[PDB]
Amino acid sequence: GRQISIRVQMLDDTQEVFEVSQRAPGKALFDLVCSHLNLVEGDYFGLEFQDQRKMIVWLDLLKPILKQIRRPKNIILRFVVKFFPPDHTQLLEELTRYLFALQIKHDLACGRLTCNESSAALLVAHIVQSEIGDFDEVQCKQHLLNNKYIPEQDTLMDKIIGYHRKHVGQTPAESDYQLLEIARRLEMYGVRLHPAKDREGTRLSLAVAHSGVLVFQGHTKINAFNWSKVRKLSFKRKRFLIKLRCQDTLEFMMGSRDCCKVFWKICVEYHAFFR
């Protein structure tokens, strides 16, 4: 039950080091990171890391820390959004919105968030507005060459300039709000994909949202199974099972027995968070 030190990385590319008991629940560490950030609406967030199997796993806030930690000297947890709500104007804390805008900033660069060209330009133009202020032909075009917010940004540079000339006078807090309003309508918003194959042997991807379970081909949404139309979620070894209310039980082959367990957990945790 001794104390250990854990290095947590924040959404602003900074890192801190906290000290928690080994036998303490994950919630204890999660509380320290929230109070360090003065995060009042921390319910939307979580701590994720890569395990020994090199797959990114959430930190169980109910289980002990030493159960899910291996070498706290080498592992870096990262504070990330865990649940993306549908309504965005209700996020009371301006800081809470700010961490979300940072989150979208990250997903935009990783490729976890893709969208239409004009949408992507507008989303960047708000990020630029929040960071360097009002438009300036000299400063802006320079700033887009020193900072790459989306892959293949150079081809999209002219459109970002146009949108930036419109955001004049908007504060960074006003820009984060515009980020969320424009990002929350995106097909890939808050979407973290789990690869799978149907009985047809078709390479697809499954995900979960506030509305329910999602099915993607590449990055295009295929089906949506709302919680109202989802009877039971199950998994056997390397096959996922979705029972509907009753059509049939759609089977999905996934990568490993752990992949099913991971997706199964976040499906229950998503429904339990919105119902």
Numbering used by the authors: 38 to 282, 290 to 319
From the manuscript:
FARP1 (FERM, RhoGEF and pleckstrin domain-containing protein 1) and its close homolog FARP2 were identified as guanine nucleotide exchange factors (GEFs) for RhoGTPases that play regulatory roles in neuronal development. FARP1 and FARP2 share a conserved domain architecture, containing a N-terminal 4.1, ezrin, radixin and moesin (FERM) domain, which is followed by a long linker (~200 residues) that connects to a Dbl-homology (DH) domain and two pleckstrin homology (PH) domains. We determined crystal structures of the FERM domains of zebrafish FARP1 (zfFARP1), mouse FARP2 (mFARP2) and zebrafish FARP2 (zfFARP2). As expected from their high degree of sequence identity (>60%), the structures of these FERM domains are very similar to one another, with root mean square deviations within 1.0 Å.
The FERM domain in FARP1 mediates interactions with the intracellular sequences of the transmembrane proteins PlexinA4 and SynCAM 15,8. While the FERM domains in FARP1 and DAL-1 only share ~40% sequence identity, the residues in the binding groove of these two FERM domains are nearly identical as shown by the structural superimposition, strongly suggesting that the interaction between FARP1 and SynCAM 1 uses the same binding mode. We mutated Trp306 in human FARP1 to glutamate (W306E) to disrupt FARP1-SynCAM 1 interactions. According to the FERM/SynCAM 1 binding mode discussed above, Trp306 (corresponding to Trp308 in zebrafish FARP1) is important for interacting with the “GXY” motif in SynCAM 1. The corresponding site in the FERM domains of FARP1 and FARP2 contains a negatively charged residue (Asp97, Glu100 and Asp107 in zfFARP1, mFARP2 and zfFARP2, respectively), suggesting that it cannot serve as a phosphatidylinositol binding site in these FERM domains. Overall, the surface of these FERM domains show highly polarized surface electrostatic potential, with one side positively charged while the opposite side negatively charged. According to the binding mode between the FARP1 FERM and SynCAM 1 proposed above, the side of the FERM domain proximal to the membrane displays positive electrostatic potential. The positively charged surface on the FERM domain likely interacts with the negatively charged lipid membrane surface, thereby facilitating the membrane localization of FARP1 and its interaction with SynCAM 1. In particular, the FERM domains of FARP1 and FARP2 contain a Lys-Arg-Lys-Arg (KRKR) motif in the loop connecting strands β5 to β6 in the F3 subdomain, which is highly conserved in FARP1/2 from different species. A similar motif is also present in FRMD7 (FERM domain-containing protein 7), which has a FERM domain that is closely related to that in FARP1 and FARP2 (~60% sequence identity). The KRKR motif constitutes a major part of the positively charged surface, and may serve as a lipid binding site for targeting FARP1/2 to the plasma membrane.
